[PDB]
Structure formats: structure tokens, C-alpha cells
Amino acid sequence: TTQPALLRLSDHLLANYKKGVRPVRDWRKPTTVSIDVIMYAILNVDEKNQVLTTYIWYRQYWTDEFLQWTPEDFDNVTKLSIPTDSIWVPDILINEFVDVGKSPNIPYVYVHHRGEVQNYKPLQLVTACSLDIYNFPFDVQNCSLTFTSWLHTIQDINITLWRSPEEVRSDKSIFINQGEWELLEVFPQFKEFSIDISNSYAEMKFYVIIRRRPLFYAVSLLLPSIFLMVVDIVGFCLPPDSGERVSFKITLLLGYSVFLIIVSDTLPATAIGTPLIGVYFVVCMALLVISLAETIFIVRLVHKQDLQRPVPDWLRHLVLDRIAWILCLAVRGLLQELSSIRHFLEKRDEMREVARDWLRVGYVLDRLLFRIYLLAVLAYSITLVTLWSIWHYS
Amino acid sequence: TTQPALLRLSDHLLANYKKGVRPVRDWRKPTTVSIDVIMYAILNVDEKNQVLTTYIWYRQYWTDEFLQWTPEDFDNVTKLSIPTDSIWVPDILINEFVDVGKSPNIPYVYVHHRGEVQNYKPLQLVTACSLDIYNFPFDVQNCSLTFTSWLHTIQDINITLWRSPEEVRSDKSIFINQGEWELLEVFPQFKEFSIDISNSYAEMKFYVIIRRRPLFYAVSLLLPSIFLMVVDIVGFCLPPDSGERVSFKITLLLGYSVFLIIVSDTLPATAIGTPLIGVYFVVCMALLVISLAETIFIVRLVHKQDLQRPVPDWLRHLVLDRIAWILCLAVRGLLQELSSIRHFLEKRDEMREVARDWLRVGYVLDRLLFRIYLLAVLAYSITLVTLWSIWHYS
Amino acid sequence: TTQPALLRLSDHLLANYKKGVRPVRDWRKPTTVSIDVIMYAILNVDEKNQVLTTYIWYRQYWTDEFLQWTPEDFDNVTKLSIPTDSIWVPDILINEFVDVGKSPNIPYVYVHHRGEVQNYKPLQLVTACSLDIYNFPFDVQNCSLTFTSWLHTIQDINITLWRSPEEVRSDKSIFINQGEWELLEVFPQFKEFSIDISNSYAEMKFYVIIRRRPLFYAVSLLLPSIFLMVVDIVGFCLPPDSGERVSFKITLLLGYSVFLIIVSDTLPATAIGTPLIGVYFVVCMALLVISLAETIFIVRLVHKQDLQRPVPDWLRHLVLDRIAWILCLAVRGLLQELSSIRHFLEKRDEMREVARDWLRVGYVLDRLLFRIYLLAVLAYSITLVTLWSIWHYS
Amino acid sequence: TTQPALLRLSDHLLANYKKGVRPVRDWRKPTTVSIDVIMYAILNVDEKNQVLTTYIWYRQYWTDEFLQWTPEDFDNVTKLSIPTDSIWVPDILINEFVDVGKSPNIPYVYVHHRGEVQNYKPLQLVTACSLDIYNFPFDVQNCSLTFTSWLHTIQDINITLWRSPEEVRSDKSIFINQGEWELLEVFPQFKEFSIDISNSYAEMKFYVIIRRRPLFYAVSLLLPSIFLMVVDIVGFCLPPDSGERVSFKITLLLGYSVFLIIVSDTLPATAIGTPLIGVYFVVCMALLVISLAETIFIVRLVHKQDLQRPVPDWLRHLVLDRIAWILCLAVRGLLQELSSIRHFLEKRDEMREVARDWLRVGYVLDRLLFRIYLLAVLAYSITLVTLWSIWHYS
Amino acid sequence: TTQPALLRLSDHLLANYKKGVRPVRDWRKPTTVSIDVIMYAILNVDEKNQVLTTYIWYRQYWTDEFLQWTPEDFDNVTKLSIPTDSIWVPDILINEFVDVGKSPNIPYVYVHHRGEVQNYKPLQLVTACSLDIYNFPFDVQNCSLTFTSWLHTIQDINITLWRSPEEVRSDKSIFINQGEWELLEVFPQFKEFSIDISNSYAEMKFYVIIRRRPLFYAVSLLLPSIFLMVVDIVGFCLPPDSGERVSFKITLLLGYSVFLIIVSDTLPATAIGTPLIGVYFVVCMALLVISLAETIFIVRLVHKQDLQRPVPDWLRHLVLDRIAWILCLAVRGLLQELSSIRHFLEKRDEMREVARDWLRVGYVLDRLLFRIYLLAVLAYSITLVTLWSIWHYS
């Protein structure tokens, strides 16, 4: 030979090479690819459509007996680059595809002098997964990625791992944080899928486990929920016979019903009904209708509608018993005129004695029901805290 | 011959192969493809645009007399992989396309030693279908997928099924649940479409039947609808002559009119007008205007506008009859002064006797109309339940 | 010859075939394509951007003298399939393109034994059209599709119809209904476009005519518009001197101003200003400010501000004339004390005689203005109906 | 020769043709393309992202010495069609690209018998431009399109115009109107860009000038802005001591604060802060807080809080001076009883003489401040009109 | 030779050229590309998804020993254009890709007569970056772009800069301003990445530093925040015993709670919780509940509920001490009648002496708490200004 360059190697082993045949000498031996995956970003999690969108880095190698040479007599070269669209490439797909992601192409591969062809490529993938929203801001997910050959059976293409499955589990090296989702582990597992006898497909199954960072959802829906509690605590300081107390309570019930609608648009719920957050807002509604149902009852008792005497059954029971529980001819003709005028006033002042007994009853019930409502807020406030400390401790 | 590899088979039957001709020896026999479909995901159902978006797995096989060999004298090989873009592939399309879905390509096929070419491919498909929204949260749909050859007539390409149509009906194996739609069955049916004489197109028609899971739409629009009923039940406890009762009722009618607008944006309605849910909200409006039209009538009767006597026709009819139905010189000159003062007060106290008769009438009408409104809520509440039990039982 | 297959025909007429030349023997004769179109779906109508999005089925045929053979001595074959990317295909485009729609490719054509090449293909097309929104829910549109050759003049490519233009007008066979738009007719027309002398382009122009189904827009904006009328009719039943009547009227004017904003976001308007619906909502506003301007006038007259006598010009004119139009030493020292007390009360009771004359005037004006407002609602209600019956009858 | 067809010309000049070389005999002469552009549609103007989206029609011609023939001895043919992907095509791009628009391909070109190759193609283009929003509904824009060769310098590719730059300016022939933007002119200009010595790029620069049609934005934000003025004009007719006047004014200030938020979402603002429309809404707010700050002052003066005498400094100044400016043993024991009763009433009636002086002051200030507020609305109303007439006149 | 054209050079060096081999004579020397980047536009910054979208201009050159010629004997040509898809091109990608941006292709390169191949191309790129939103309207960002060879190691492809890294830092020449983001500098840095021994990848890392223009976010959320302060300042001018003062304060607390919701939708927050703007709105809420908690306390003290004497401990402490701190048989029978009438009035007037002491206390507390609230607004107003002047000065 001569020494024109060292492209004469690439002339030697791609002259009569057929890129359609599965590259083995004996057709009874399978081609064994070897894959692994490191995780780069969680792009989107769609809880409504049950669709996960990620981005991984991927690599694989296999072996072919048509790409071999002796390293000497080619000036000691041991590896070179060959374009991707001129050799045989296996068809490794994912079972959980629902769409095609856009990813850059890598137009070259490595080839060592034994036939080991290495292939590095990144690929965005959109998959379908089952998402449980039982406990919304504190939830781990368990999504699957199943690499498999879509056509070839197990006596043609077999799938192994590159490296040992302990290094794949504990590899959080190039992941992008600060993005609402925290990667925990990526655990691989081989299983040998078969649809019947004599048609078996090898497949490799990766389980990704991600956990939501709950810090976003303690200022968007926990902060106004405890804020409209303390507005009702200062709302009971109004005296009941004023008139604005009824207009006060219906205004913020209108104000909180707007809050339930505008926030439930940005919080999904699938296949369960509601999460456990939706239970803890019905308790917020029921704790506020009882606030409205007790100011609707004092106003009915404290009013001037020409009403009768307070019952002495319920005067002894209320005023005197709750004082230790919560608190601590012309001379005749003019005489007929004046006695009728006095009768017109002694009818009037006892009608002012109507209210002062019912005002006294209506104030003792208002301070009694204020303490019971203040405990029910306080008893439920520690229950919401003492469940959060169970999660936070380890 | 020699033994250089076993790509000499692929040299043998793709040397002078023409990928343009329909592959038969005698041109009078049709090519018979054989298809079937299993269902993977319901991606989107657009009730406004009448467009369904799914994702299926698809496979097919046919037969060609140009891809045949004897299995012996090729070292007993019986099947091999051939790239897809180097053989004849039939053009099986869908009639109901409105767009092109993105799906991965599969670059290989199988070829057995008789000519049976097998082809596996997944394909996302966007179709047009007729959607009935007559009963919104409880509705089954009946969508069609019609596989047909777009150019070739029935004496060129004929379509059969792979397997028997009982296995295709009862195949819910890899479907993705927890996604608002439940797959019921996929039923195939062959029919022989013809536009005129001597131009007949074979086609295979799959009917997918899906049912909506109604659990999403019992917390988003059933829960506030029964909530603003119980606010009006505690709204009648206000006495009518206070003044805030009219301001109470108009506030939540404003509050519910916001609710009808914000929820009807996320609930579609096509070609019918409204579903049966929209009928059951006009009843919610008419049951609340009557709540406003009766507090607008007691306030007109219970007021101090210098008004006359209550009619004894309507005192005997109301107070005494509904008590068993629902409830159980200087001596003359000073005398002229005092008699004029008494006349100024005996005019005043009978004007306080104005209201106490009309307050008494206005309270009996308020407890009478409270019972009738409480039954009409209760009579309609059981009717809404007793229709739900008909659906739920089988 | 031999009998190896019958691909020897396709070897015969695609051996030395050049797919770049316009296929005629004499270069002076034009190639005459023949097209027609049936309509499949109206996908989107964007009134803001003036862009129509449809989906049609399309077919065409032409003639070439290079694809001819005698049917005998090829075993009586008369037609065959040839791939599309190996023959000459004319460039028929649309003038009104603004974008490229995604549509499936059809990789085969028919070729008869005279040169008649048939080509079936579906194609989604996005076009630009002029949309008049003068009368919004009752509007027909007149959109154009202009098929033309983009490069070749009329002495190279000429365009005819497949079938007669009566069959193209009356062809509503595979159109997808229940989709807000109803197809009326598709009328073709040939016209011979020229930019100057000796450069003339043949073109075929289809006019599609679609009509909007108005049933969607009688429950989304007609139903709340007549609903807030009847709330004002029961709003005049409040007596004016109560105080909540002013707070009642401003609440639903706030409530209707929200309705004008949230509904005008989903109703377009281009190049005219407003449609005729927007005129019929300014009348709804002006009919409700007059409702607010008359309750602002009775409250000014019916009030206790230490005011003077009602004018006897306007007592004879109002109370007595509208009763037939709408309705049917110590004895001296004590005497100085009592006469001063009587003077303190006879000043008081005539101040109660202030209001009872002005209450009587304010009630007659309230029942007078109630009848005039009730007719103006009733006179405008029949005018809105009697224009709808003109449209509905034929 | 023979007469087999007239594709023997296309065999003559595409046999040994190389589509990679820049087609000149002498390599020192540049290839001179000649372009022009007519404008078809303004698809989108994104004021937030500074991105313009249009659609043009484009054509160009150049000259090559490899595509020449004598018209005789080819049966007098003078031009023919050649596919586009088999000749040299220059790389004319735009500097202002930010994305790639989808546009149809035209697979043919013309070639005359001197080498003049003509090329017609439409192309959608998305560009980046500077948009000034200083005066929002009345604004012209000045966007640039710069055609240039991306690689070749000026001694390889030079750019000229097809026709004279007066015809390109005054060409509004196929533009699509009724689309919020009106085309004014398209003015071309050649400039010779150079990055240093001996590397100069020729470029042709088109300036498009578009003007917004302001009719869309006189019914969406001018009509409610003048509507909530006239509600405050009829809002001053309430007497101040009623009580609903304060609740009236805060309701529509709530009602207008909703209007500022919902309309500013659909009105952009970049790099300036606000346009001049945002200045004319702060004036609308400041003209309405002064309406609230004067009803907050009369209610403070007109009230019953056990208050003292009106100051005679401010009684002479107010009541009597503004009447020409805006308006036009037993006999002793009973005597001690009656004198104490008279003292209890003569204390009461002078407390009714409290308010009637302060009511009289509070009514004169209310009619005084009503005239000043009515002029300030009227003085600003003509200023808003007299600036609109400056724009409208020429 | 002859002189047929000067495409005989392009025949000379692309006849037997292989576009797959890495073009070196000795395979032990690496190919050294040389890149740089100028910055054109910041298209989008997505703070939620941590994704940056830009558009750059890019160029590179390398050297190959297969594209060399002597400039003489080819008529002195020194450079020419060669199509891009017929030579070797290195695979320079970015590590931070998450998607593929659409960018125009440039189909030509330059080749000098030593082998220097130059390549100009623009490219839109979508990358992933870490965004800190600790201080929202005043924030610089530090995003990375890492150019690297995706397959070849450092003994195959090595990366250098075109020009010195001082010119790349100070190059703001063609950047598009007026677009919410200001470019500060683009600083390059070479680092030599290695995954283990004997596998090292060269990479070049550009740091772009952008700063947000804060002018957009001083009219959208600073202007209504200081506006609803001055409405509460004129809200304390109401006297407390009127009744509308409680209804005034709850209306704008409803009005500001709408403002917090509608503006927080368009303001992102990631991985921190809230920015420092969210701290300065909780102070706006706490400064307004204290405004509501002090009008809820004066109304409780200033009311008529049949209450007792003001405590002389708190009369000396309040009224007299804060006056220097903030402010500056028949004769017996008729006698029994009149003494009972006087007793009925001397009970009444001292009940009018109930309120005038509590009105006097309630007015001194109202002017005292008005000054303290007016200082706390004024003390916090200068603190918000004096932090803004620290940023603005240099």
C-alpha cells in the first residue's frame, strides 16, 4: 500500500457494509445492548392529563462482528468516529410514550477495534403515569420508564445494564434543583415480558421517584385561610343590637366564597374526589356558618318587637347561674286628666323595661358563645400543627 | 458459494426488488392486509370542537410473492429484519382525520420465509366525532375509527382482522385509567363501501365506547349549589322589621350570579342548547327569587307609613284561623289646656297601636311562608336523590 | 421476452423518465388539470385575526404522453400504482394562505393506459378571509378559496373542473355537523387572472358560504339580560322611606357592570365598532339608570329635614287630579307654665304633619312612575320579539 | 439528431451541471440578484415581546452562464421550467429573524435562454422590532426588514431592486384590510454594511409603516369611563343626613377599581412606564376621591352628637353672603313641679335647634361644592374633546 | 488542461472526498475549533419553569488538510463557497438544552486555500437556568451557556476562542433593548471537564448577566398600594356613632383582598417562598386590620345600651390629662300625680346624660388613635423611600 492518509481504514470496513442486516456471524446469537440513564430535569407534571415530561441523558453500546480490524498495520489506531446513519442501530423505545419530544441529533458514534459501538444521545420524553393526589402538598410519585425493543424478540435483542444498579440508584449529580420537584432515586429492574409462548420481549424498567417541595403551597392557600379566622375573632366585639354585625358576617362569607373558587382552579384533583386539603376547607366553612348562625340568634332575641316577659324558668337558669361560670267637681275632673296622662307614661317606661331584661340575657349568651367558639378555633389549631410536626420530624 | 456471512440472503432478495409495484404474481388477486388495534390512552376530548385525541397500538400483516426463499441452504434461517423504506407498504388511513398526530417511526419489519410481512407501529390520531352532551356528568360516547385504503379499490387491497372480533371487544389490558374517561369496549365491524358501480373500497370500522367518570363534577358544582340553600334557610330567622333582611337576600343573589358565570365557562354545551344540569339551575334561581319576593312583601306590610286599620275581613281570616293551623273661669281655662295635651298624647299612642296589629299580621305570614318554603326545598331534595339512585343501582 | 413477473411494465416506462420536464410532446399545448373539492369540517373561525381553518378532500387529474402503453402484450393490464415522488406533479396552490397546515401524505397515484394520472389527497388549509360581525349571532359568511398555479402561466397549465358545477354546489354529504357552523353551498367559478399583457394565470375560485347556529348565544347572554330586568320589577315594591331601596339599586348596577365585562371578553368585534347586540345593551343600561334616577328623586322628596309646606299649586295638581288617572297670682303663674308646655307640643305635632303630606305626594309619584316604567319594559319587550319572528319565518 | 420529444434540451444543460459552484465564467464578477416585495397581511403584533408576524409575497432573479442555449435548433423554445433543488440558489436571509415561519415550497423556477432564472415564493416571517406605546390607540410603527446574504461578501453577491423604488412605496394592492392595522407605505433603501476592511455585506432594507385603527378602543375603555362619571352626578342628589350617601360612593369606587384591573390586563405597556391613556385614568381617580372627600365632610358637619353653637364668624360668612353667590304652700309646691317639667322640655327643643342651624350650613356647602365639581367635570370634558379634534382634522 | 470555467477547482477537491472521517493527516492531532458569540435578544424568561429563551449569532472555524490547494494555477482564486452538507462538520452542542429551537439554515461555508473553513449561523436556543427571585423587581441573573463536543474527547476536538475574552465581555452592539431585560456582560471561560481518567471533554462556558428593568412594576403594584392608604386616612374623618364607619372599613378590606389575589397571579415565586415584596404587603395588611380593630373599639364604647357611669379612675386619667397632650286632700292628690310625672322625666334626661360622657370619652380616644396611626404610616413611608435611594445611588 501507500500512505495517502488514514481514511483508508474507513474505506476498508464501510465499502461492502450493509446497514440493514442485524450484524452477527452466526444468526443464533442475540445482540446484547447495554444501557443506562442519568436524570437531568423534570420539565412538567400534568396532574389532570396524567402526563409526565422529563429530559434525560442516555447512552448505550453493543457489539458487531463486521466492524473489526487489527490495530496494527493501520498505524496503531484503536478507535474512530463513524456517522450514525451508515451502521446498524437497534430500535430501543419506551412503552409509555404518548407523544414525541424534540431532542437534538448526535451524528457520530465511536467504534473500537473489537466491534464495541458506543452511542451517546440526549432525549426529551413525554410519558404517561399514574399520579395520586391523596395528600396534595406532601406527595411522592412513582413513575415508570420501560426501555424495550419494539420489534425484535429476546433471541434477537437482549438488554443489560452498563454499570451496576447501585450506582444508578445513588446518582444525583447533574439534576436541576429549585424547580418544585426533588429527585429521590432512580432504581432499575430487569423483567422478561412475554405475550405467549415463543414470543418474549426483553425490557428494562426504571422507576423514578420524585417528591414535591411543599413550600409553594403554604403562602398561596394557608396564609389567607388563617387570615379570615382572625377577622371573625375581632368581629364578635360588635354589640349585637347595633345592626352592622349581620352585615359584617355576610360580607366576609362572600369574601371567602370568592377565595374557594379562585384557588381551586389552580389545584387539581383526579380519581379520588378531593385530597385531604379539601376536607380541611369544609371544616373552615362549617366553622364560619356557626359564626353566622349564632349572630342570627342573638339579633332575634335582642330586638324591640313589642314582646313579653322573659320566662322566670330561663331567668333563674341564665342570669343567676352563669354569674359564677363565665363572668363574675273641678278637683275630680282635673284628677281624671292627670291619672290618664300618668297611665300613658307608665305604659311607656315598662316598654323600656322590655329590652333591658332581654338585653341582659342577650349579652350573657354572647359572652358564653364567644368562649366556646374561641376554644373550637384553638382546639382545631393545635390539631393542624401536631400533624405537621409528625411529617417534619424525619 | 462461500461462507462470508449470512447477509447473502438479504443480497439475494433485495437486489432487483422494485418497491413501487403491488407485489403479486397474477395481477388479478388482491393483497389482503390483516389489522387489529388495542387501546392505550384517551388524551383529550374537546366537546366544543367535536374532536377526539387518542393513542393506540397498531399492527398489520400482508403477503408478497417477491420475498420468498427456501429456509434450507441459507443455514436454516426462517425470518429476518428488513428496513421499512425498502419494501412495498400499503396506504391504510382513517376517514375521520382532521389533523396529523406526531408518533415515533419504527424502521424495521419482519419477513417470514413465505412472504408474511409483519409491521408493528404506534400512532397518535386526532379524529372528529359526534358528542352528545344531553346529560353532562353521566354520558357515554360512541366514536368511530374507520380504517380504509385511500386509493386502491377492493380488487387491489382487501382488509380483514388479525384475530376474532370477540378478543378485540374484551381487551382492556394496557389502558391507562385515572384519567376522567373509562374504556368500555372496542367493537369492530367490516362494511364494503362503494361510491358507484365498479369502484368499491373495503373498510374496517372500530367503535370505541367511553364513559365519563362523574366524580369530578360533584365537588365543583354540586357542593356550592347545596351550600347557598342552607344560607337562605338561616336567612329567614331575621325579623322583618330590622332592615338588614333585604340587604341580606340581595347579597347572596349577587353571590350566586357570580357562581353561575364562573362555572359555565368550564362546562360545554353543543347542538342541544343546555344539558339537564342547566335545567336544574334555573330551578335553583326560581327557588331563590321566591325567597326574595316574600321578604319584599312582609317589609311592605310591616312598616310605619301612617297607615290605617287592618281589615276585619283579614283579621278574622288570619289571626284567629291560623292559630290552629301552624302555631298554637280659671278652672275652665286650665281644663281646656289639659284636655288639649291629653288629645296630643291619645293621638300618639294609637299610632303606636298602628304597628302592633300589623306586626302581628306580618309575623303570622312569616311563619306560614317559612313552612311552605321549607317543604319545597325538602320536596325537591328527595327528587334529586331518587333520580341518582336509579343511575347508581346497576 | 420471458414471464418473470409483471413489474416489467414499470421497468418499461420509468427507465428513462425525467421527472423535471413538463410532460408534452409538442411544447405549445398546455397541460390541463381538472380539480374538485368536497368539504369535510370547519375547524376554527377566528373573527379577531380574520383567519379561517378548514379541512377538505381534494382530487385532480391531468394527462401526460410519456406514461402510455398498449394494454395488450402486458397481460391486459389497464392501470397501476406508481409512487408520487417519481413523476411530474403540478404546483396548485391557494392564494389565501397565511400558514401551512399539517396533512397526511398519499404516496401513490393511479395511471391509466392513456396517460390519465389521478391523484387523491386530503389537505388542511388555513386561509385569510373577510368576516362581517354586523349582526353577531345571525350571520352568514362568504369565504373564498382560489386554486391557482403559482409559477406557470396559462399557456403551460390550465385549470378546469372535474364534474359540472351543479354537483359541486349541492354536495353536503360527508360534512361534520353539530359544530356551531352550518355549510350552505360551495360554488365554483373560473376567472382568468392577468397581471399585464402576455402573463396570464388561470385560476379556479370556490366560494364557501357558512352560517352560524345561533342557539349557543341565547343562553349565555340573553338569559341573564332578561333576568336582571325582573329583579328591578320586584325592586320597586320597597317603600321609599325605608333606606335599603337606594342600596338595593346600586348593588345590581354593580352586578350588571360585572356582566358586561365578563361576556364582552368572549364576543369579538372588528372593523365596525360594535354589532347590533351592543346597541341592545346600551338600551339595557339606559333603562336601568332611569330606574336609579327615579328612586334618587323620591328619597329626596320623602325625608325629614325640617322642610316647609307642600305648594298648593302642586297639591291640587297632584293629589286631587291623579285620583282619577292611576288610583281610585298663682292661677296666672301656673297658666303661663302650661301654655308654654302646650306650645312646646303644638310645635312638635305639626312637624309630624310635615311628613304626612310629603309622604302622600311621594307615594302618588311612586305609583305613577311605576306604571310608566312598566310600559317601557313591555313596549321594548315586544319589539325584541317581533324582530326575532321576522328572522325565524323563512 | 432525432425528434423523440423536447426533453432533450433539459438533457443538454443539466447533464454535467454542478449545483454547488457559484455560477460564473470569470470568478471576479459578482452575481447580482434583484428582489422586491409586496405586502399581504399583518398577522400579529406582540407589544410585550417586541415581535412582529407578517406574510409577504417575494420574487427574485439572477443570471448564470451555465444555463444558456440558442433558441433555434431546439424548436424555438425560449423558456422552460426546472425544479428548484437542481440549480444554484442564493442564500438571502433577514437579519431580524427570531424564529422560522411555516410557508409553502415552490418546486419550480423559470429559465430564459440568456440565463435569467426567476424565482417566485411566498414566505411567512417573524421578526423583532421596536414598538413605541407612548400614545396607545393613535400610534404609527416603523418596522424594518433587512434582506442580506448571510455568508457571501459584496464581491460575490450583490443586491439590487427589481423595479424602481417609487412603485414599491405606492403599492397597496393585495393587502388584507379590516384587521386592526392599516398599511401606509413600504419604502426600500440600499446600504452597504461592513464589519471591517475587506469584508463588506450588501443589504437591502425595507421599512414598513403601519398605523393602528383606533375604533376598537373607544367602546372598550372610553364608554365605561364616561359612564361612571354620570352615576356620580346623580349621586349628589341624595341629601347628606340620610345615611346611604356614604355607602353609595364607596360602592362605585369599588366598582371602578375592578374596571382598572380587568382592562389593564389587555392593554400593554413597555419601556416607557405608561402611555398617555394611563395619565388620563389617574385624573379619573383623583376626580372621584374628591367626590368621596366632600361627602365625608358634610356628614361630619351634619350629624347629632350633642354639639355646640355654629360660630357667628362662620354664620355671617356663610348663610348671609352665599345668598347672592349661588342661591337666591300647695300653690308653690305644684309650681316647683311644673317649672321643672318645663325645664326638661326647654332643654329638649333647643337640642332640636342644634341641627337646624347645622343642617342649614350643611346644605349651602353641598350646593356650593356641587357647582364646583360640575365645572371641573365640564372643564376637563372639553379638553378631552379639543385634543381629539386636533388628531381628526388632517 | 483547458479553460471551460473555474468549477474545475471544485471538481478537484470534492471528487474523492469522504465527509465521514475526521479530517487530519496524522490521527494523533486534535481538530481545534474556534468559536465566539454575540447576543441578539432575550425572548422569554420563565421564572416558574426555570427556562430561558434567547437568540444569538454564532460563528466558528477549524482546519482540515483535505481542502487545500495552491492559489496559482487556478487563476489566483483564494477562497470559494462550498455547500455545508458535503464536508465534515463538528458537533458542538450546549449542555443546558431542554428543547430544540427553530432557526434558519445556512447552506454555505467559506474555504480558504490553507484549509480554514469558516461557518456563520444564527441559532435560537432554549436553556435551563437557576433564577433567584429573592428581590423581585431589582434582580440580576447569572445564566450559563456551555458549548461542548457531545461525543469526541479532548484528543479529538478541542475548543478555543476566536478573539480575546476582553472583546467578548464588552460587546453590546446589536442587542435589542426596550424589552424588560438589559444585557450587562457576556464573559467566557474555558474549563476542562472529565468524567474519569482518559475521558476528558473540552468545553467553553459563557456567562450571560441580565438585569430586569424595574419600571414596569412601579405602576402595576406600587400605585394601588399607596392609593388604598389615603382612602383610609380620609376614612377616619367619619364620626364613630354614625353607623357607616364600620361598613366603610370592611368594604375596602374586601377591595384590597381582591387586589392581593389578582396581582399575585402575575408575579412568580420559586424555591424561597416569597420575595421581599411579599413581606411588604403583609405589613400593608397588618396596618389595615389595626385600622379596623380601632373602629371596632370606639363603636363598642360609643353606643346606647342602658350603660352605667364612666369610671372616675378613667375620667381623671382621660379627659383632664389629655387636654394638654393632644388637644387644647286634692292639693295632695294632684301633687302625687305631678311628682310621679317629674320622676318619669328625670329618669329620662339622665339617660341622655349617659351618652354625653361616653361620647366625650369616645372622641378623645378617636383623636388620640388618629395621631398614632398617622405617624405609623409616616414612619413606614420614609423607610420605604430610604431603601430605594440606596439602590438608586450608583
Ligand SMILES: *[C@@H]1O[C@H](CO)[C@H](O[C@@H]2O[C@H](CO)[C@@H](O)[C@H](O)[C@H]2NC(C)=O)[C@H](O)[C@H]1NC(C)=O
Ligand atoms: C414503585 O412501584 C413499584 C411497583 O412496580 C415498586 O414495587 C415493588 O418493589 C419491589 C422492590 O422495590 C419489587 O420486588 C416488587 O416486584 C415491586 N412490585 C411490583 C408489582 O413490581 C417500587 O418499590 C415503588 N417505589 C416506591 C418508592 O415505593
Ligand SMILES: *[C@@H]1O[C@H](CO)[C@H](O[C@@H]2O[C@H](CO)[C@@H](O)[C@H](O)[C@H]2NC(C)=O)[C@H](O)[C@H]1NC(C)=O
Ligand atoms: C456567575 O456565576 C459564576 C459561577 O460559576 C461566577 O463565579 C465565579 O467567578 C470567578 C470569576 O468571575 C471565577 O474565578 C470562579 O471560578 C467562579 N466560580 C465558579 C464556581 O466557577 C460569576 O462571577 C458570576 N457572575 C456574576 C456577575 O456574579
Ligand SMILES: Cc1nccn1CC1CCc2c(c3ccccc3n2C)C1=O
Ligand atoms: C455532558 C457531556 N459533555 C460531553 C459529553 N457529554 C455527555 C455525557 C457525559 C457523561 C455522561 C453521560 C451519561 C449518560 C448516561 C449515563 C451516564 C453518563 N455520563 C457519565 C453523557 O451523556
